[PDB]
């Protein structure tokens, strides 16, 4: 049985399946009770109760510490950070505690049943604090997993996988896709492997890597690429950031010989760095052209300059041109 869904609806779906299956599961954060600022937990408090879906005070460091507390109990804690831009007050709780819970206790205690959801990426005009892509910050941190979906279907599978994974997981939801194109999404629970990149279009001349909304962009740059330069691109969706599918990538690049990675996040320190430097080491012989990185600028996210800030399809394409014209 399947229903057509919005990204935000598939999330409510996965979240519903979870409270439904797990008597322990609990959802909390700022303004989550009435449905949330993006409608992700709508109805849920009525269908399951005031002690399973509720508002916390306005304090992100407490929200996560609180979540870690429940998790330690073996109970499923699904914390919400209204905006990924506001997850830093909790950065200490995530890096020094959660990512290190199991390890420092020699497996005596853990917060593996802890999951943090948070609206990610840019939107119309989030400016500096409703547009960030914090992903790279958490990538330098052993112990947590970081997952970013690209559509309603991927969202529900990945999220549910995150919720049930035995490791603290951060689930970043591209807010720009919350009301974008719908799609049939299974009504009941279902999972999608974490740490598995997905090739959604094989090609033979270049390997394109991105995640989140960017995937749809590299997907377009593909259409253009071949149709305007006769070049078959292999489009790949990374999905999981920290424990990343190193193999699926290197394999593709070996078949291709060229690599172009892109992400809204700033260039410097961005995740594309770890990928490039890695593929460079692995596929050093297969590389016919220098690895390319089409990322946001090394500046904060502009309000009125967004159109000029992002690695839109044109910036990628042109970048692809120069690479190929190598």
């Amino acid at each position: 049985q399947t229903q057509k869904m919005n990204l935000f609806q598939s999330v409510t779906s996965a979240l519903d399946n979870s409270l439904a299956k797990d008597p322990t599961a609990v959802i909390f954060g700022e303004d989550v009770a009435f449905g949330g600022v993006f409608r992700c937990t709508v109805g849920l408090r009525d269908k399951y109760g005031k002690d399973r879906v509720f508002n916390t005070p306005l304090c992100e460091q407490g929200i996560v510490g609180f979540g870690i507390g429940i998790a330690v109990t073996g109970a499923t804690a699904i914390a919400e950070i209204q905006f990924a831009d506001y997850i830093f007050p909790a950065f200490d709780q995530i890096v020094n505690e959660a990512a290190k819970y199991r390890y420092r206790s020699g497996d005596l205690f853990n917060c593996g049943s802890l999951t943090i959801r948070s609206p990610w990426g840019c939107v119309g005009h989030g400016a500096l604090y409703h547009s960030q892509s914090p992903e790279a910050f958490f990538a330098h941190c052993p112990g947590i997993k970081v997952v970013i979906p690209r559509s309603p279907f991927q969202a529900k599978g990945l999220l549910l996988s995150c919720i049930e994974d035995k490791n603290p997981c951060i689930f970043f939801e591209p807010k720009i896709l919350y009301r974008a194109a719908a799609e049939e999404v299974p009504i009941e629970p279902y999972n999608i492997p974490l740490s598995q990149a997905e090739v959604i279009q094989e090609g033979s001349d270049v390997t394109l890597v991105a995640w989140g909304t960017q995937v749809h962009v590299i997907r377009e740059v593909a259409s253009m690429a071949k149709e305007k330069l006769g070049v078959s691109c292999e489009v790949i969706d990374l999905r999981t950031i920290i424990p990343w599918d190193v193999d699926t990538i290197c394999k593709s690049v070996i078949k291709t010989g060229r690599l172009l990675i892109s992400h809204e996040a700033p260039l410097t320190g961005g995740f594309a760095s770890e990928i490039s430097s890695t593929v460079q080491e692995e596929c050093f012989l297969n590389l016919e052209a220098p690895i390319s990185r089409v990322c946001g600028y090394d500046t904060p996210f502009p309000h009125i300059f967004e159109p000029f800030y992002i690695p839109d399809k044109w910036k990628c394409y042109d970048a692809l041109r120069k690479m190929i014209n190598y």
Partner: protein, 382 residues
């Protein structure tokens, strides 16, 4: 006793201290819902002129709020937040301030600027992100700032300015500036870790600071009953060693008096002061919020203006017209100006532009030379 951490007699009896939340801290008020001064011993100085400025700016803000909110509902501006019901809060405090005093805010105190005579042109310029915006259209609307009117540029992360403000106050103290610092924040923001930090540091380092909390009963969808269980914010001040007071946020005189006193003692004793102004958020949390999905200052001061024969219906009728005309006049002017030159998104990241950052600059240049037809180059400057 002798214990280093506190001074107090012992006690043979085991008694837990219970929060007094029933008859919590009294709400201070000077005039009633009909502009009538309750206790004359509290009636402020306030010459007709000053009292009229308080009125005209609360109403000028209200007139502006409407024009901008509608403006948002038309896609003219991307975001907007109203001040409905919290105008007394902005104007009272501001008037009790010395113009050179430093202000740190959240985002719902545009009245503070209105009082400090901030240009309608600039209010509109920021929300539109056009060239006249000294911010260079880099932040969302309502994130105002003016180095001249001493209003620290507002930022979205809640409560972050609190500790910053205290630091600023410390700097002040050292300079013997006779200047105080005011830091506004909502009752919701007070839950943030930075609030705890801000209040403690302020007391521990003895700083000339006023903490102004706008307890308007809400934090978007969250009711205060979910933000705390103590006697609101006013009751936390003492725990930190901060002189605290609660005020009727819809009473401009009660706000003014409290603020004026807090400034005197703060600059005199280098002692932090906390003012919790009880009020109610009449409008939606923001343009992006349908407040009906989960849940007056001007009127009062108006009466007080009549009871003294300081205002009449004809005079009022004309003010609506003038302010309307004036606001709408800044409105149109801001509308037809082009947004800054795209090169401005790379500047000011650091003082000097890093060479590598400059390489990205030149890159967008080469890029626009070739694909600029796919961009809104005509909408921006140069």
């Amino acid at each position: 006793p002798q214990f280093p951490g506190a001074s107090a007699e012992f006690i043979d009896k085991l008694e837990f201290i219970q929060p007094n939340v029933i008859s919590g801290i009294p709400i201070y008020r000077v005039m009633d819902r009909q502009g009538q001064i309750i206790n004359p011993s509290e009636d402020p100085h306030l010459p007709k002129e000053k009292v009229l400025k308080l009125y005209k700016s609360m109403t000028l803000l209200n007139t502006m709020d409407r024009i901008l909110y509608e403006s948002q509902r038309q896609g003219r501006i991307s975001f907007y937040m109203t001040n409905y019901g919290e105008e007394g809060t902005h104007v009272g405090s501001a008037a009790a301030l010395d113009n050179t005093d430093l202000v740190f805010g959240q985002y719902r105190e545009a009245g503070v600027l209105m009082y400090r005579d901030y240009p309608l042109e600039l209010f509109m310029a920021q929300c539109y992100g056009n060239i006249s915006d000294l911010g260079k259209g880099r932040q969302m609307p309502v994130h105002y700032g003016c180095k001249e009117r001493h209003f620290v540029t507002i930022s979205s992360p809640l409560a972050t300015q609190i500790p910053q403000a205290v630091g600023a106050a410390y700097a002040a103290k050292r300079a013997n500036a006779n200047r105080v610092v005011i830091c506004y924040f909502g009752e919701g923001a007070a839950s943030e870790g930075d609030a705890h930090a801000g209040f403690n540091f302020a007391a521990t380092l003895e700083c000339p600071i006023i903490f102004f909390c706008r307890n308007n009963g809400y934090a978007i969808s969250t009711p205060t009953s979910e933000q705390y269980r103590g006697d609101g914010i006013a009751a936390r001040g003492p725990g930190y060693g901060i002189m605290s007071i609660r005020v009727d946020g819809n009473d401009v005189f009660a706000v003014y008096n409290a603020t004026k006193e807090a400034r005197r003692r703060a600059v005199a004793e280098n002692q932090p002061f906390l003012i919790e102004a009880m009020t109610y958020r009449i409008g939606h949390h923001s343009t992006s919020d349908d407040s009906s999905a989960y849940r007056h200052p001007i009127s009062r001061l108006r009466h007080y203006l009549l009871s003294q024969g300081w205002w009449d219906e004809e005079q009022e009728k004309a003010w609506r017209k003038q302010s309307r005309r004036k606001v709408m006049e800044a409105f149109e002017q801001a509308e037809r100006k082009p947004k800054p030159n795209p090169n401005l998104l790379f500047s000011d990241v650091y003082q000097e532009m890093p060479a590598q950052l400059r390489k990205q600059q030149e890159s967008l240049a080469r890029h626009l030379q070739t694909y600029g037809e796919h961009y809104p180059l005509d909408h921006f400057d140069k």
